[PDB]
Scaffold this motif. Structure first.
Motif, PDB file in Angstrom:
ATOM      1  N   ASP A   1      26.425  42.658  42.406  1.00  0.00           N
ATOM      2  CA  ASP A   1      25.069  42.842  42.843  1.00  0.00           C
ATOM      3  C   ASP A   1      24.881  44.335  42.799  1.00  0.00           C
ATOM      4  N   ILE A   2      23.915  44.794  42.019  1.00  0.00           N
ATOM      5  CA  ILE A   2      23.647  46.205  41.870  1.00  0.00           C
ATOM      6  C   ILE A   2      23.361  46.901  43.212  1.00  0.00           C
ATOM      7  N   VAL A   3      22.811  46.181  44.200  1.00  0.00           N
ATOM      8  CA  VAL A   3      22.570  46.743  45.535  1.00  0.00           C
ATOM      9  C   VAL A   3      23.906  47.069  46.195  1.00  0.00           C
TER      10      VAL A   3
ATOM     11  N   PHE B   1      24.302  40.365  38.149  1.00  0.00           N
ATOM     12  CA  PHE B   1      24.374  39.635  39.414  1.00  0.00           C
ATOM     13  C   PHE B   1      24.995  38.242  39.279  1.00  0.00           C
TER      14      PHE B   1
ATOM     15  N   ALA C   1      15.136  43.667  45.490  1.00  0.00           N
ATOM     16  CA  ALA C   1      16.426  43.783  46.131  1.00  0.00           C
ATOM     17  C   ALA C   1      16.761  45.243  46.426  1.00  0.00           C
TER      18      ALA C   1
ATOM     19  N   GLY D   1      13.219  40.264  42.087  1.00  0.00           N
ATOM     20  CA  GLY D   1      14.282  40.638  41.154  1.00  0.00           C
ATOM     21  C   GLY D   1      15.090  41.829  41.640  1.00  0.00           C
ATOM     22  N   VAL D   2      15.607  42.631  40.703  1.00  0.00           N
ATOM     23  CA  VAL D   2      16.354  43.837  41.064  1.00  0.00           C
ATOM     24  C   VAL D   2      15.485  44.809  41.905  1.00  0.00           C
TER      25      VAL D   2
END
Ligand code: W17
Length: 165
Positions: free
Chosen positions: A18-20, A152, A48, A44-45
């Motif tokens: 998860d990029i977060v 993700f 988030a 989406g991204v």
């Protein structure tokens, strides 16, 4: 630095993450957001990443839009990375679900070339409607700087790695 990434090419790396969570752990110099022209980080991204900043990304983005107007599809702007990164490179890939030109995906990835290293999602993938396999191909054929892609979805990550030419 970045850990557990699979090396695809000389400069492109990929991880099922998860990029977060990747941004919070690494705090890269640049995190790329999958932005729209209005910088409305609803889902989406973008939704988030914005939610991880406690909406500070949206507040900053609305001030940016009030001053500068919307971005172009294929364009970008550098804003604060808040608690995620030093900077956030908001890149607008074409949204296929809004009938936008998929040919603009190469222009969108060209924005990455202005940064030596970036943590990024696949542009126009997810809710933007493009084929993620095509997005990865445009990424490795366009980006010359060091890009660490966070995918993700585990099933999609496996599909991308196993089908990478
Ligand atoms: N990294 C992503 O594509 C994504 C989309 N929604 N979320 C919610 C959890 O952070 C993550």
């Amino acid at each position: 630095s970045f850990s557990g990434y699979l090396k695809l090419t000389d400069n492109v790396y990929i991880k099922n993450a998860d990029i977060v969570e990747e941004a919070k752990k690494v705090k890269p110099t640049v995190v790329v957001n999958a932005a729209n022209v209005y910088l409305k980080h609803g889902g989406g991204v973008a939704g988030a990443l914005n939610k991880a900043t406690n909406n500070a990304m949206q507040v900053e983005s609305d001030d940016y839009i009030a001053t500068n107007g919307p971005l172009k599809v294929g364009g970008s702007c550098v804003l604060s990375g808040h608690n995620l990164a030093k900077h956030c490179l908001h890149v607008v890939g074409p949204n296929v679900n809004k009938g936008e030109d998929i040919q603009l995906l190469k222009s969108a990835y060209e924005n990455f070339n202005q940064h030596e290293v970036l943590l990024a999602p696949l542009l126009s993938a997810g809710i933007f409607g493009a084929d993620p396999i095509h997005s990865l191909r445009v990424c490795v054929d366009t980006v010359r700087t060091n890009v660490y892609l966070a995918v993700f979805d585990k099933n999609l990550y496996d599909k991308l790695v196993s089908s990478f030419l």
